[PDB]
Structures are given as C-alpha cells and as structure tokens.
Design a protein around this nucleic acid. Structure first.
Lengths: 151, 50, 208, 137, 98, 100
RNA sequence: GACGGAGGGGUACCACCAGACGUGGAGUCUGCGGCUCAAUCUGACUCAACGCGCGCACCUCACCAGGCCCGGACGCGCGGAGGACCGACAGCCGGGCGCGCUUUCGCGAUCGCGCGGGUGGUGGUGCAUGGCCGCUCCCAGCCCGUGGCGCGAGCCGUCUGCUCCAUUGCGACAACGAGCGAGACCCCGGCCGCGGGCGCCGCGGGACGGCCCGCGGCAGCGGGAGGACGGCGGGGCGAUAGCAGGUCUGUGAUGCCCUCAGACGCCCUGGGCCGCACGCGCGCUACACUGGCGGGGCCAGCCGGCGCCCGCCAGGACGCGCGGAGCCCCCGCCGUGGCCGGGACCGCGGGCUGGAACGCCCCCGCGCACCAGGAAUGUCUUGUAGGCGCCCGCCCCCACCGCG
C-alpha cells in the first residue's frame, strides 16, 4: 500500500502509454492510459460506481470540464492504495486529470487544457501539500496539550 | 533442608544489565537496560536523536 | 518479494552493540593508567578484533605482552568466544591533549595528588590548547574544602555550546573523582573546529 | 469483471435469493439463533441473513481469486467495534464457526476448491457467479 | 564445599589466567568451569561455591577483579600465578597459556 | 562450483554501510555481484523520560537506532568470494554474513 | 538588582480578541490527601505535586505476621583430622523446613572460637554530595581583551533611533576589536533528477524574501505572482548565572550516622500496597435521531505472520509459512418513551494465564446515575481543533495510561 513497486503486478503490459501517480493525504493512484472507447476503471471497478456515493461526482468532474469527446478514445486502469475513501476520490480525479493531460503533453492544447482544469478547480492537476503532523509529548493531539490542573 | 528454602522459583528475576535493578527492564529489543541506566549507555549502544 | 520477518541478523548486530558497551566500561575501569579513550569491534568471520584508541600502548601491552594476553582470555571467557581468537590491538593516540577522556583521567589523578583545583585545571587547559583545541573548559563540582557545594568552572578560548556541531566538534568527558569529604565530579570539554573530517557550518571560508 | 459491473449490494441480495432457491448452503438452523461476532449484542433480525452472508462470502472468494483467503481473514472482514462498555470500544472479529460452516458448504458443493492454506473459488463456482452477474446487467 | 571444586578454579586460572563470575542464584551453576566426579559426569561448580573460593583468593590477592555490567572480571596476579603453580603441582617451567 | 551466496551487510551508520557497498560492488563487479538491495531501515526506537525521578513536566528523550542492511547476490565459485571478503575494505563495527 | 495599583516601547492562543472544544455536574477508571488498619512501603504539594517516580495475585516490593541459613572474606592467639565442622531416616512439633526435638547413623578442615578487620543494606540525611533532570527561560540575552570614566562598588562597548520570531539587523556612536547563545546545524516531510532494487532506498537538487510593483538612507515592509513548497513546515540541540527544585529507593555513584548471624544481608510461606464516613487531580463513557440497532460496501499508517477444525463466544486442538482499521457510505428497523439512549451494578455459568486469583476474557439475565452540568477553569489558528480507530512501553494475564 505504501509506494510499493506493484505497477505491472496487477496487469501485464497491455501497451499502457503512461503511468501517472496522483497522491492526496497518503493515498497514491497509479493510472495506466491506452487508446480505448472512453472506458475508465478504478481498482478493477467502473469509475461511476465508487464507494462514497455522494463523492461519485468528484471522480467524474475532470471528464465534465474537459469534455466527453476528448475523454472518448482512452482506457484508464487506476489502482489506489493507502489513505482513505475521500482522499482516494481526490487522488483519482488528480490522476485522471494528469494522465489525460499527458496525452496532449507539451502541446499548446495541453497548456489550454491545464488552464481549463486549473480555472474550474486549481490543484486538480497540482498535488495538495498538506500532510499529518506528529503527536508531541504532553498532548494527545499534535498541538493540543493536557489540561493544566493548577494555574 | 537449606536448598528447599533457598531461591525457590516464584517468577522470573529479571534485572537491567549494568544496574541489577528489577524495575523498568525495558526489554523491547531484548536490551534489558534500565530506563535510567539506558540513558547513560545510549551513546555506546549507538541509539541517536532526531 | 515474499520475505519472512525473523531477520535474526538485526538482533545479532544489536547484541554486539550492547557487548561493545560492556567492553567500554570494563576497559575504562581496569586500564585507567593506560589512558584508554575509545573501543570498536572488527568482529571478523569467526574472530573478534577490538581496536582500542589509547594514550600509551606499552603499559597496556605488558612484559611479554602478558597483560594483554590475560585481558584477551578474560573477554573471550566472559563473551563465550574462542580464547586468543579475541585480539585487542592498542593504538597510541597522538594529540593526547585533544582527547578529553585522557584529560579527565589526568585531572582526576592531579586532584587525588591534592593539586589545587585552579592549578590542576589550568594544566589540563594548556595541554589541550597546545594540542590546538580552540577552547578547553574544565568544571569541578562538589564540596570543595567546604561543607557547602560549589561549582568552579575554569575555561579558556572559544567553546561552542549547542547544535549538531556539538556532537561532531566537542569532546565532552565526565569523571567522578572521589575525595575523602565526598565525590567531586569533573567535566572536561574540548572543541576543535579543524577535526579534518568536517568544517564548522557557521564558518564561511570565503576567498581572495 | 462482471461481479464489479453490477453494484456489490445489488449482486449480494439477488445472489442470497438464488442461494436459497437453488438450495445451496442450506442454513444449519442451529447457527440461525446465534449472533455473528462477539462484537454485536442483539443478533441478526434479517432471518435470511445466512443466505446474505453466504452470497457475500462467495463474492469475496471470487474477487480474491488465487489469493486463497482463510476463514479467519473473512472473520476479520466481518469484525466490528464491541460498543456498550465504559472502557473505550475496539474492533472484535466475527464468529469463526458461522463462516467455517459457509466455506464448508461451498467445498462440498465444489463451488469453491480447497487450496494450500486457505480455500479459493473453484472454476465451476466462478461460472455460476459471473453468469449471475452478467444476467443482472 | 568440595575440594575438587577448589581444584577446578585453580585449573581454570592457569588455563585462562582469568575468570568471570556473575550472581548468587545458579544459572547452569557456572557455565564454562567443568570438573569430573569419580562416579559423576562432567559437572559445573555451583556459582555459590566458585564465589566463595575466588573471594578468599582475592583477599590474599591471588586474583584482582574489576566489576563492570554485573560481572566480576578476575585477572591472575603474579602472587596468584605462584599460588596456582603450588596448587596444581606445576613448576616455573609452566607459564599460563595466555 | 556455481551456487548463490547471499551477503548481508548490517550497519548502524549510513555512510559506513555505503562505503562497504562500494567495496563489495567493486570487488564482485567482474563476478556479476548484484547492485545493493537496500532493506527498509530498521528504526528501532526507545522513548524514555529524561528525568531519573518523576519531578518536573514529564519530558521524553526520543532515541532511534536506525539499522541499514544491504543484501548482495553473487553467483560463482565459492573460493573466489571467500577471498573477495578479504579484498573488500574492512569497516570496524560493521558486519557481513554469507548464507547459501 | 528586585519590586511598583510608574511612564514609554514591544511580545505570546503555556495570554487574550473572534471562534472552537472541553473540564467542573453524573457513572466509572485511576492518582493524591484524610480515615481505618497487622500492614495499608514510601517519594512530593502553586505554576515547576496529584495515569508522576513505565502494567502491584507471588517476584516486583522498599511494608506486616511467622521462618531459613551464611553467602562474617582475610589475618593472628587458641583448639582441631578420628574428628574442626557438617548431613540426615522414623516418630514428634511445626502451613512448613532434622527447623528443632527424641534418636543414631552418615561426613571430613569445606576449619571453629575470641579479637582485629570485613562483605553487605530499596535504612536515614537530596539542606553533606556527584551525576542526571525540572524551573527561571516557548527568554534573548550573556560576556572578554585593550582603551576611556569615576576614590570605589560599578559603568562605556552592551544604542532611550529604527527593524526583526530573535543584542535579527541597519544607521550610528569613548569606545575599538572578539566570542557564546540566535541563526547556521541536525532528523523528518512534500517535490524533481540520477543510480540501485527480495523490500522503495541510496546520492544529489529545489527556495533565496530571488522576481514584479508600491513604500522605505537602510534594515526591511505591504502585496501581487510564478512555483510541490513563501516568507520561524514540524521536531532535535540548547547561552549566562542561579535554585539551598527533585532523585542517596536506577547505579561497585557516594561523605557521614544507623544497622551489621535474634541481620536493615539474602531468601521462604502467608497477607497488604488495590482497603475506604469523605475532600480533590488527570482521564473514560454517556446524556441520544447529525442517534441506537441489524446486514452489506470498505479504508489506513507507526508498522505488521497464518491455515484447518471444533466451541455461543471466550478459547482450544493439530499444523504450517506467511498478512490489514474504525469512522464513513448503502438499505432496513426503532421511532422523542430514561425508550431499543446509557451501561453502572449484581446472580449462576463457560474460558484463560500461572505453582497458586483476588487478574483478565465471555454467555444469559440484572438494568444506576446522567435528559447537557453552578461559581470557576483549561487547550487550540490546517491537515490544526475535534471526532474516529490502531500500535507499541511496562507485561503470566491485564489500559479508561503514556508514547507513537
């Protein structure tokens, strides 16, 4: 689950042109993109059917802003490990956006496509830096501290 | 006789190497060093800070 | 890919580390006259090599190297290893003044010779300064000829106090010299900016 | 593949009716009045729960494929918190016997085959699971 | 306390020129010292017995001990080497192996 | 003959272990010695109260012994690798072990 | 120097604004005082005592009621190898142990005694001490050489200007050059290369208030950007001078006093430390519907074994080489009722661990307060608070604790 070398272990070859990584809150998604019919699969499951039923629109959000026709013609195999459900829904939208953009690459269309995503939602194509802080002695919380009995 | 009244086993008698103290053996990695005894000998074991 | 977690090898390395620290203490106790500073184990395949950094090798060697021979078999017996396979190689350490552990030993002897605390401390300071320490500090604490406890610190030159460089550039040695009235603990701190291996982070060498 | 295309819950409920209709498993009816998991307190109120658990356990063994997961591992998949104590609640594994009974029926049925360590789904059972999945689609 | 146990301690002292001892309770008696009983197999002298003999030798000064990490570290003295030679019926020709 | 001999280097200090790695790779490079397989670091940790007594706000000293282990794969004659062990630079306090 | 209910500057969620989330109320867990005791071993009491001195059936364990020896070395005067000493069967006493007694067989200086001298002691005195830590101080301050000023104590440097997280800088200046602390450093994290790879793990880069615009001799300041990352990201280290802070019960650290074979040595059995009219400090679980209860989905990380069969679980047997959360989401149900909220108590019973329960686990009962907590008070600014799991430390078993 922790950044293990298990990219090809799920699927052997299959001409996966790209192997993007999207990471949010200790959750990493390796997304493999090849020419397809517009199918996207996450954890060997249809992308539309995702566990947080409320957050199932967040996963499909990059497809909507970029356009279905641009997405059509791509097949993506995404494997998410680490982290938790909401971060895994944030990681896959980031992985999908980065991987679809990789097909355009250094093109002027990519610069527009990166800007198009960055305008609807910035950090959709940019990793979120926030990470958990450590517990410090004298407090149950990272910054919280024990109640002072006297004074 | 004397032997039957001498060190009969009731439980393990475990001591910190260097201190001979039963309290706080700290055998987390089989290092039976006292909590206080360990701080004097940590550099020698090579244990280091951040 | 599949790995068993027994990894007994990590335990083996750790047990030797604890053994090295049992050696450090035993070397300091019996070989105080020798001027022993530090110990390490080569721990070769089947054989034990201990290299001891020490002020004088001959005193540790002994007539016909007999003293070393007894020590090699005492350690071999204690650590349940082949007698004689254990070999200690004593290394004279040059720049004796820089090695704090030799200097607490010298100061402790002077204090037991009843040298005045200022006289004994100043003698240790000059030897370290001649060996090139940028700063030498000796602190003597306890009941100095009084029933009340003082803490006279004698220091000369520049000595750093905090930071990771304290680990690299400061040799801090602690002794517990025993006097009739009561224990007098002495700390000798010696700081060398030029230790060859590393440079002071703060110092900027600049150029012409 | 197939069992994924149909939502997991819409497959398990339909498969529960299928595994009661085809006569697969056959509830022990001695475990019918028992509560799965030391963790819970009031026992299943479904009354067809054995069939839901049976269809869920085959669906797990199908997605496991050659992983060949054990019965204790399946019990840790039905682990919940033991709530109702002043001491803070912690996760507690499900009853091993219930799952052991379910896996035993599948081995006799040959829906699941025995393997080194834990048992895994047999090809004959996989055929039933995927045809049902595609049929729901 | 048996005389043969005393003999083995002296025999170990010429053989190793030293001895290491630990605590009062017996863990395999003292591992590393062995004597043979006439109708007995190779046997270990008890930690209690070895402690008594070596301490008696130490007061006279047969051995000098340093205590580190819960272990005595006896080293044979010159006076002790003379004593061990009389004890084992040895001569000035014999020198301790180390 | 031709067996596989597993060398494992266990060292507390990273720079010391990296030096052993350089010598082992260099001596066996001709013998097809494998590149270093770095083990997940064993960050054995003891956290103890700084005070001998219980007085003061409880403070904690966080001590971490990191052990770095490199596994080496060489397939060749046994006699050569026995000599290869002598050839590689000896680092004091660092251990090597060969398992067939 | 210290203090000021003196002035002027600052500065901090250990301080407040603005908000959050609590304690105090209750039931429990667990310390502390008081009480009772055979003993309830003690340390310490504002911050800087009170889940603190790293998990008390025995051991720990220092306390109480019985008991057992030497583990009193060594050296001298004396005695002594056919008896210095030392062992015991059976009964008898004694929880008990030739422990002793009756008794009548063993053994061999393993030496006895007196004296001198030890070896010990969780025994005292932390206000005799070392060492270590806590606190002043989440401070930014401390100081030297040479010169100047005063009889001097003591000043100047070391600044009543500005700036900064900060003697952090700049502009000055009877001061002129330094040093320590601050910064740098170190560990970690996030991002990008390169090399390796049983396993993600080795070596480097990147960010500097650099750019842009305003404002500022300046030091900087406010924005705008680009950029994983923006202006102390979180930790480690920690000046100077002290405290008569704490630890002699961590220590072959230790002065001195006590003890020192009817032992304060070291063990052995039993019992306490865990009692409890009560007062108080951490915590924990609740007071419900944003909830409880049933199935189903299923998600980690410090870091990490499993299978099969039986048992209601708890747990067991027999094997082998391995492996993973709650919350939340989804569908039902109860439905404002101290109710199915809550789970305190208490009666059988089933397990476990150990030598032994009084320890723990579990099954059917049983169904306490509490319907939101007065006067007070505490912690906290982003992956933070809070909610929610999980691991480890000590450990036979055991966490409402600590550290992660």
């Amino acid at each position: 689950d922790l950044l293990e070398r298990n990219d090809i272990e799920v699927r052997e070859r299959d001409k996966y042109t790209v192997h993007t990584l999207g990471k949010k809150k200790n959750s990493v998604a390796v997304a493999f993109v090849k020419a397809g019919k517009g199918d996207i699969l996450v954890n060997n499951v249809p992308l539309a059917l995702v566990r947080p039923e409320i957050l199932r629109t967040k996963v499909s959000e990059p497809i909507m802003i970029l356009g279905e026709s641009l997405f059509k013609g791509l097949d993506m195999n995404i494997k998410v490990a680490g982290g938790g459900h909401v971060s895994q829904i944030y990681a896959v939208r980031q992985a999908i956006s980065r991987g679809v953009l990789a097909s355009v690459k250094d093109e002027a269309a990519r610069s527009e496509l990166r800007a198009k995503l960055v305008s609807y939602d910035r950090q959709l194509v940019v990793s979120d830096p926030r990470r958990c802080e450590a517990k410090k002695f004298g407090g149950r919380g990272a910054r919280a501290r024990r109640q002072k009995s006297y004074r | 006789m004397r032997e039957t009244e001498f060190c009969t086993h009731i439980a393990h008698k475990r001591e910190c190497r260097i201190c001979g103290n039963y309290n706080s053996v700290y055998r987390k990695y089989g290092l039976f060093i006292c909590r206080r005894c360990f701080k004097e000998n940590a550099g020698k074991i090579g244990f280091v800070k951040l | 890919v599949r790995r068993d977690e027994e990894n007994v090898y990590y335990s083996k390395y750790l047990n030797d580390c604890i053994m090295e620290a049992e050696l450090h203490e035993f070397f300091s106790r019996e070989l105080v006259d020798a001027g022993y500073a530090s110990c390490s184990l080569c721990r070769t395949i089947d054989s034990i090599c201990v290299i001891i950094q020490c002020a004088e090798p001959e005193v540790v060697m002994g007539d016909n190297h007999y003293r070393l021979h007894k020590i090699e078999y005492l350690l071999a017996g204690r650590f349940m290893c082949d007698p004689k396979n254990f070999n200690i190689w004593v290394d004279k350490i040059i720049k004796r003044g820089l090695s704090a552990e030799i200097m607490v030993d010298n100061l402790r002897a002077k204090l037991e010779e009843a040298m005045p605390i200022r006289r004994a401390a100043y003698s240790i300071i000059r030897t370290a300064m001649r060996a090139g320490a940028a700063g030498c500090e000796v602190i003597v604490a306890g009941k100095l000829r009084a029933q009340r406890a003082r803490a006279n610190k004698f220091k000369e030159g520049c000595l750093i106090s905090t930071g990771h460089p304290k680990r690299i550039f400061l040799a801090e040695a602690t002794r517990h010299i025993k006097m009739r009235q009561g224990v007098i603990g002495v700390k000798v701190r010696i700081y060398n900016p030029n230790i060859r291996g590393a440079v002071m982070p703060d110092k900027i060498e600049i150029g012409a | 593949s197939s069992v994924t295309r149909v939502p997991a819950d819409v497959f398990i409920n339909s498969f529960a009716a299928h595994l009661k209709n085809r006569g697969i498993i056959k509830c022990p009816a001695f475990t019918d009045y028992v509560k799965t998991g030391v963790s819970r307190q009031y026992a299943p109120r479904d009354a067809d729960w054995f069939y839901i658990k049976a269809a869920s356990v085959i669906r797990h063994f199908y997605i496991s494929g050659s992983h060949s997961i054990g019965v204790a591992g399946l019990a840790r998949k039905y682990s919940s918190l033991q709530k109702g104590k002043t001491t803070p609640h912690h996760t507690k594994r499900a009853s091993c016997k219930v799952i052991r009974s379910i896996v035993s029926q599948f081995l006799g049925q040959k829906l699941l085959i025995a393997g080194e360590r834990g048992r895994h789904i047999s090809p004959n059972g996989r055929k039933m699971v995927e045809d049902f999945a595609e049929g729901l689609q | 306390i048996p005389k043969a146990v005393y003999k083995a301690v002296y025999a170990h002292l010429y053989e190793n020129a030293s001895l290491a001892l630990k605590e009062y309770w017996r863990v395999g008696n003292v591992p590393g010292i062995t004597y043979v009983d006439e109708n007995g197999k190779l046997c270990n002298p008890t930690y209690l017995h070895v402690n008594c003999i070596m301490q008696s030798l130490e007061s006279r000064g047969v051995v000098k001990d340093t205590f580190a990490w819960r272990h005595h570290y006896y080293l044979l003295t010159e006076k002790g080497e003379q004593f061990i030679r009389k004890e084992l019926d040895l001569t000035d020709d014999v020198l301790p192996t180390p | 003959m031709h067996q596989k001999y597993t060398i494992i280097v266990v060292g507390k200090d990273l720079k010391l272990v990296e030096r052993y790695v350089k010598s082992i790779v260099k001596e066996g490079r001709a013998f097809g010695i494998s590149g270093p397989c770095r083990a997940p670091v064993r960050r054995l940790t003891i956290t103890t109260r700084k005070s001998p007594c219980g007085e003061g706000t409880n403070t904690w000293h966080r001590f971490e012994l990191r052990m770095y282990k490199r596994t080496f794969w060489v397939t060749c004659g046994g006699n050569d690798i026995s000599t290869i062990l002598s050839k590689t630079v000896v680092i004091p306090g660092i251990q090597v072990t060969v398992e067939v």
